[PDB]
Design a protein around this ligand. Structure first.
Ligand SMILES: [Mg+2]
Ligand SMILES: [Mg+2]
Ligand SMILES: [Mg+2]
Lengths: 363, 364
């Protein structure tokens, strides 16, 4: 049925690496000393979980992860609080999303509580990698791949679940948010109804690289994902999309696309919606937003802020959109950004223990 | 923007050779030969020299982008031992073309197509006793290209691995008759979308299909009929192209297949079948949209002769039944010969095994 944290076999590294300067860190480039691995087969089920030194995987070249993208991942973070206790943030939501992704991948199910405990054991061993800074954190990358050594397209009879750790630094520079410009070309689609875009399966990402390179060489930084005949705004890069504006009815509104199958249900997205409801200061709407809705609002000076949301950076303000040849300015930064900054402050307060709330777990 | 070169091949022969399988008990994709081709790439130094070496595990940094973001693609083609004992490839330059276009779309580094093909030929030549001694088995060739970027950002890879595996494959049919397949047709799943990568052989197009295939077998079916759009266009069958031999709505006999409008993989077998059928000039050949409604209208109508899938492994695969909206719909493929399917199978097979010449084959 499942591996068990009580069976953990731990092989410590005998040489330890020096830690990076948290302020000089690129996301996903530096790894800690150890990793978690757990093997599965249909014949014997789950093997015992191992923590061992970071090393290459040994994979049969026919492994289905390499041929048919039988893989999924997660992302969550460990935070060194102002009281020096290490916290995780809503990790159970990630365990939930990962399990669902595994079912949809036909990867073997596991006990979410045991995985969580194994990750905590790994973070505990490598806890010195959790930076001494309230603008840096330790990124946790659970990954799950088919290692079926046969070329049939089929449910894997072998798999590997592993966890990597990677320190992540601040996304601010010169004291402020560093806004992004987006490339909006409806020729590309990220996800479609009946597809797998609401799951964190590897398959959804390989096809985005071409569009990202096109964004870059037009001097944008990220892609604005459009969908349907009406050019709905869905996501920004690998982040969920929020729009703070005066809506059609002249009402102040925080809007985000609904979970209708083509939106990844981000943890950050869920938390922001919970905050905004609790505050009760403006309307909170999961609703469709089109490029027309947006360009109209802009002409009528009704847009206050646009930002992405995701684990790594929390929130990411948008300053410009390149669409049908014209550079459209978004006034996010000229408006503070008031709401983006409030959300970043509130989320980080919770993550670093400045505010105690049950969204976090110590250890 | 360079290439590895066949001239530079470094060959490390296996000291211990494995016993070949019985041609008549082969399961696709299960048994591998003694050697493999590997070629390393980096943005810093470009392509390394190609290696032929013993089949062995890959050693990948766990951050490799193939494992996280499906930065990967593959191909599939075959080698055949002819009636004259010469080993042939079939239309391989088409596989090289498709592989190249797949690499571009995946943002993996380009290479020279002729150089890859040549390296594949040297691999096969080394492992040539693995090309089955059988008139209905062949050697399946699996070129694979993966991103091995050791970093978690979603980006164009700065490291990659190109490799090739060889795998004997046997007949799909025995004692002179096809084994037809039944299809599960549920419009809730969508294989591919306009503006997506369904017309490339990128790994990410396949991961999403396991769940539907499992749902198919849990319903007694063997394969998925992939439907698209509000009018339920029939597109592909499993990982095969879809052909329909019928009397069309104008009362003409027609071979029909969905057009290459972005959601269809351009199969080599598909191309060959269309080429043959255009050349025969005995019925109308139409790249055209086909819907579940067209299909069921034609059946209650007795206008359908045959439906079949096409693909490199089995060549052609007759369809006997479709499960759609609770209903089992019989397709009369097997009660109509299946003449056209048998003809295509004989014709392509004759070409592949050298019983007939057409400049569609290359001798090793
Ligand atoms: Mg989309
Ligand atoms: Mg996704
Ligand atoms: Mg969103």
């Amino acid at each position: 049925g499942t591996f068990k944290a009580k069976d953990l076999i731990v092989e410590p590294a005998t040489i330890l690496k020096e830690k990076p300067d948290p302020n000089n860190l690129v996301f996903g480039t530096v790894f800690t000393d150890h990793m978690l691995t757990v093997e599965w087969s249909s014949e014997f089920g789950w093997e015992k979980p191992h923590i061992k030194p970071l090393q290459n995987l040994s994979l049969h070249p026919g492994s289905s992860a390499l041929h048919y993208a039988v893989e999924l991942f997660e992302g969550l973070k460990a935070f060194r609080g102002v009281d020096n206790k290490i916290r995780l943030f809503q990790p159970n939501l990630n365990m939930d999303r990962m399990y669902r992704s595994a079912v949809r991948a036909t990867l073997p199910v596991f006990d979410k509580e045991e995985l969580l405990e194994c990750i905590q054991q790994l973070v505990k061993l490598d806890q010195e990698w959790v930076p001494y800074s309230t603008s840096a954190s330790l990124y946790i990358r659970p990954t799950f791949i088919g290692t079926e050594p046969s070329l049939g397209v089929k449910k894997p009879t072998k798999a590997l679940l592993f966890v990597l750790l990677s320190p992540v630094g601040p996304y601010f520079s010169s004291g402020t948010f560093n806004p992004v410009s987006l490339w909006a070309n409806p020729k590309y689609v990220r996800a479609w109804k009946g597809g797998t875009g609401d799951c964190k399966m590897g398959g959804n990402y390989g096809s985005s690289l071409f569009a990202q390179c096109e964004a870059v060489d037009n001097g944008c930084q990220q892609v604005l994902w459009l969908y349907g005949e009406d050019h709905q705004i869905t996501e920004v890069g690998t982040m969920n999309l929020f729009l703070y504006w005066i809506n059609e009815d002249g009402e102040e509104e925080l809007a985000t696309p609904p979970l209708d199958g083509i939106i990844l249900p981000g943890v950050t997205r869920r938390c922001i919606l919970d905050l905004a409801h609790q505050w009760g200061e403006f309307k909170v709407s999961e609703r469709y937003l089109t490029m027309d809705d947006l360009t109209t609002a802009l002409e009528g000076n009704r847009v206050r802020e646009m930002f992405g949301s995701g684990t790594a950076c929390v929130v990411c303000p948008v300053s410009d959109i390149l669409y049908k040849g014209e550079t459209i300015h978004i006034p996010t930064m000229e408006n503070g950004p008031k709401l983006a900054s409030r959300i970043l402050s509130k989320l980080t307060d919770i993550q670093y223990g400045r505010e105690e709330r049950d969204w976090t777990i110590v250890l």
